[PDB]
Amino acid sequence: TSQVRQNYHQDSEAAINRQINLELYASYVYLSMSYYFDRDDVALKNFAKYFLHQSHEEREHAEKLMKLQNQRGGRIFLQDIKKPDCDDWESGLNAMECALHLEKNVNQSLLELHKLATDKNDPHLCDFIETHYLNEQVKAIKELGDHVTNLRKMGAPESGLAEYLFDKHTL
Amino acid sequence: TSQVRQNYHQDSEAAINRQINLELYASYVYLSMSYYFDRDDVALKNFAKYFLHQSHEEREHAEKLMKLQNQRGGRIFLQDIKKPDCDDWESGLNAMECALHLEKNVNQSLLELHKLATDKNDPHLCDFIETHYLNEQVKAIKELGDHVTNLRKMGAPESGLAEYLFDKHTL
Amino acid sequence: TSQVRQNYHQDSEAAINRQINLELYASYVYLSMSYYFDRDDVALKNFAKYFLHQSHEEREHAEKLMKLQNQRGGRIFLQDIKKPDCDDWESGLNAMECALHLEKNVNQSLLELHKLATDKNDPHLCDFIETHYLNEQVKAIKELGDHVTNLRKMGAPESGLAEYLFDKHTL
Amino acid sequence: TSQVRQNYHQDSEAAINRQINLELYASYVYLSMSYYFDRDDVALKNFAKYFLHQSHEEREHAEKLMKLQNQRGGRIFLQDIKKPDCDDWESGLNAMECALHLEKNVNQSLLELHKLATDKNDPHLCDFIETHYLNEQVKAIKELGDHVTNLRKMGAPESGLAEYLFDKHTL
Amino acid sequence: TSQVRQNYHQDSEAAINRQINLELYASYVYLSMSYYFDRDDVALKNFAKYFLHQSHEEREHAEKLMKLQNQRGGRIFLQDIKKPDCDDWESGLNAMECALHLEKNVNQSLLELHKLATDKNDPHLCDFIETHYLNEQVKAIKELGDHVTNLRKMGAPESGLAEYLFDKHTL
Amino acid sequence: TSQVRQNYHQDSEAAINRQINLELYASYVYLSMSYYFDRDDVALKNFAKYFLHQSHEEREHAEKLMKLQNQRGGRIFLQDIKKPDCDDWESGLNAMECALHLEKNVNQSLLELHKLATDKNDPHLCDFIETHYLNEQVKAIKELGDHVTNLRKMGAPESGLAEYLFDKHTL
Ligand SMILES: [Fe+2]
Ligand SMILES: [Fe+2]
C-alpha cells in the first residue's frame, strides 16, 4: 504494498483482525440477554433496555477498529460469529454475574494487544489503545460490581420483591 | 332491498349483530370491576382508574361495529345485556386473571367472524377485521400476562405490601 | 357493618339501586334512537349527533349515583339492562315525542326518591337530590316541548322540507 | 424479461391495463356533468364544483395504477377513451342517480380483479387492492345514497325551491 | 404451555426462527461491502455511506421479528452467523448487481412464509407479513434496478469518470 | 335561442368544438411520454417530471375553452379521444423532437381559428385568441428548439453520459 503504509507489522495486522471478531461476538451475547427479559413469564422492562444499550455500544467499538485497519494500510478479513453459550439466563443476578465475567475477558485481551504493540515500537498504536479502550473497561467493571453487590444485599435471587424494586429504582 | 347494498350476505349480517352484543357485555363487566375497588374496605385507586379506562374503550368498539352495519346496507337489532357473573372480586390478582380469561374469549369469537368472511368471498369485511380488531387483542393479552406474572412474583395475594407497591409503581 | 356508615337506612339503599338501573336503561334507548337516523334512507346527521350527546349524559348520571352509594356505606347490586321497546322510530317528530315521554317518567321516579328521603330524616340525601337532579329535569322537559311545538307548526310530519330545514337551522 | 420481475402473471398484467382505461373513462364522464351545470339556463354553481372535484380524483386513481404497473415489471398499453353516453343530464336528481349507477360498476370490476389476484397466489397485489381501492368505494356509494334520499324527500325534481335550497345548504 | 398462546402452530414458530437468521446474515454482508469502499485504493465515500445505511436497516428488521416471536408465545433460538462469500467486491457496478441478487432471495423466502401462514389459518401472521415486509421489498428491488441501468449506460465499469460522476450526482 | 347570445356565428361554434378535442388529445400524448421515462430500463426522473407538467397544462387550456363556449351562448359536444401514435419513444432527443412537431401543429390550427374570427366580424373572439393563446405557443416552440440544439451538440443519442448530464443540470 500500500502507498500509505509505514511502520506497521504483520503481527499487529493479525491481532487487530482477532479483536474485531471478539467485539462482534460480545454484541451478539448482549442481544440474546436483552430479549430474554422481554418474555411474558419474566417481564422486567428496564433490564431489557439496559442490555439493549450495551449491545448497541459493542458494535461501535468494532466499527472503530475497522476504520483504524483501513487508516494504517492493512486489509480486513472476517470470520464466522458463533452463537452464545446460554439460551436461558435464569435470573437477574445471574445475568449480571455473566456480564462481569465477559467484560474481564475483553480487558485481558486488550492488555496483550498493548504488550505486542510495545514489543514492536509502534507508538501510534499504543496511543490508540490507551486513549480509546482502557479507561472505558475499568469503568464498566466497577459499575457491574456495584450492581451485583446491591442485588446480593437486598436478598436476591430468592425474593421477587428485591428484583422488582431494583428494576424500578436503579434502572 | 337497500339501494347501497352489494355483495353482502345474510349470515354476515347476523354475525355482526352478535358481536355488537358481546362488546356491550364486556363493557358492563369492566364497569362492575371498577367500582369494586372504590369501596372503603378495599381502597385502591389506580386499579379503579385502570378498569374504568377499559370500560370506556369497549363501548367505542361497539359503536364502530354499528357504523359498519349501516355502511354496508344491513339493519341493527339489539338484545338484552345480561348482568356480570361475579359481584365481589376478592383480590387484585383475581381480577387480572378474570380479565385475561375474558379477552381470550373475545379473540376466539373474532377468529370465527374472519373464517366466515373468508368462506363467503367478502374482502372488504376481511380487511376491516384484520385492520381494526386483531392486533389490538394480542397486545391486550400480552399486557395482562405481564401484570399477572409480576403480581405472582412479588408475593400476592397473601401480602398487602405487594399490592400496595404495585398500585403505586406500575399503575 | 361498615366503619363509615351513619344514619343510612336499608330502604334508601334499595331505592338507589333501582335508580341506577333506570339511568342505564335510558342511556341504551338514546343510543338506539341515534343510529336509526344514520341509515341511508333516513339520513339526518344533526338528529343523530343530538341523540348521541344525550346518550353520553345519562351514563354520567348513573356513575355519580354509584359514587354516592360507596360514600355512604352501602353495597351496589346490578341487574339486567332490558332492550328498548321500539326498533324503528318512524319520523323526527315521533322521536321527540317519545323522548319527552321518557324524561317525564324519570322525573316522577326522582320525586318519590325525595319523599322517601324526607320520611326517614336524611338531610344529606335530600340535599344531594335537590342539588344535582331536580333542576336539570325541568330544563330538559322545557327544551323538548319547544322542539315539538316548532316542528308541529312548520308542518311536519307530512312535509320533508320542514324536517330538512329544522335539521339545518336549529340543530 | 425484465430484471425486476418476480411472481407476476400475464393475466394480471392484462387486467391492470383494462382498469386503467376504465378510470380514465369515468373521469371524462364527470367532466361532462360538471360543465352541464354551468349553462345560463341551468345555473347551479355548487353542483358544478362538486362534479369537477370528482373528475380530478379519478385521474389520480389512474396514475397510481400506472405506477404499480411499472413497479412490478409489466408494460403499459393505452386504448381509445370513448365519449359519454349522455349529452344533457336533465336535472340535479338525475345526475346523482347516474353517478351512483357508475360507482357501483367500478366496484364490481375491482372485486373481480381481487378474485383473479387470489387465484394466482399474488399477495402483494391483493394487499394493494385492499388498502387503496376498496374502502373508498363503499364510502362514495354511501354518500351518493344519502344525497339521493334527501333530494327525493324535499320534493325534487318538480320543485325548483328544493334544488336551490339543497345547492345552498348541503353543497 | 405459555399463558398467552392461542392459535399458533409449531411450524410457524420454526419458520420465524429461520427468517431471523437470514436477516442477521444480510446485515453482515452489507457491513462487509461498506468498508471495502473505504480503502485508499478504491476511495468512494458515498458508496460507503449508502451501504452502511442498508446494514443498519437489516438489523431493525431482525429485532422486529424477535418482538413478534415473544408476543405470540413462542421461544427464540439463535444459530451461528456465517461469513460473507466475497472478500473483494471488484467495482461499483459489481456490488450493485450482488445487492440486487441478495434482495431477490430474501423476497422469495418471505413469499413461502406467507403461503405457510395461509395453509394454517393464521390471519394475524398473514396481516403482519403483508403490512410490514412486502411493499418494502418491491421498492428496494426497483431502486437497485434503476441504479444498475444508469451505471451501465454511463459506460462503467471500464471508465473511472463514470463512477466518479455517479458518486457525486446521485448518491 | 339562448337569452345571452349576441353576434355569435354557427361556424365559430363548430370550430371551438374542434379545438377542445385537439387540446385533450395533446394532454393524453404527454401523459404517455411521461410514464415511458419511468421504466426501470430507461430510468430518467427529470424527463418524467417535465412531461407530467406539460400534461397538466394542456387540460387547463381545454377547460378554459369550454368556459368561453358557455359564456357566449353555444353548446358543447364531445367526441372520442384517440390513442397516441407511438408506444415506445426510443430516446430523449427523439421525444423532444416529437414534442416540437406537436406544438407546431397546434399553432397552425389556432392561426386558422383567428382568420375565421376575422372573416366574421367578431372582435371579442379575436381578442380572446390573441390574449390567451398566441404568445404562449411561440415561447414553447423557442424552448423546445433550445433543448434539441443542446442535446445534439453534447453528443446524443449515441452517448449515455450526455443524457445523464442533461437530466442533472438543465432539468
Ligand atoms: Fe418504594
Ligand atoms: Fe458535472
Side-chain angles (χ1 to χ4, degrees), chain A residues 36-44 46-48 50-86 89-92:
Chain A
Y36 169 87
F37 286 102
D38 195 49
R39 289 154 51 151
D40 74 289
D41 45 344
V42 182
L44 291 160
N46 293 134
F47 277 87
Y50 182 83
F51 290 126
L52 201 60
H53 178 84
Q54 300 305 317
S55 176
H56 283 352
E57 305 284 302
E58 291 315 313
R59 160 86 174 226
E60 286 170 351
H61 295 170
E63 293 192 27
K64 214 193 293 180
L65 284 159
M66 282 158 103
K67 212 193 84 162
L68 172 89
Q69 184 86 264
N70 269 335
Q71 265 168 338
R72 292 303 300 277
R75 295 298 170 243
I76 299 166
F77 286 107
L78 304 160
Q79 295 303 308
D80 284 353
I81 312 174
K82 313 294 282 273
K83 50 174 295 196
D85 277 327
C86 298
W89 300 95
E90 199 171 323
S91 178

Side-chain angles (χ1 to χ4, degrees), chain A residues 165 169, chain B residues 165 169:
Chain A
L165 294 169
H169 293 304
Chain B
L165 294 169
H169 293 304

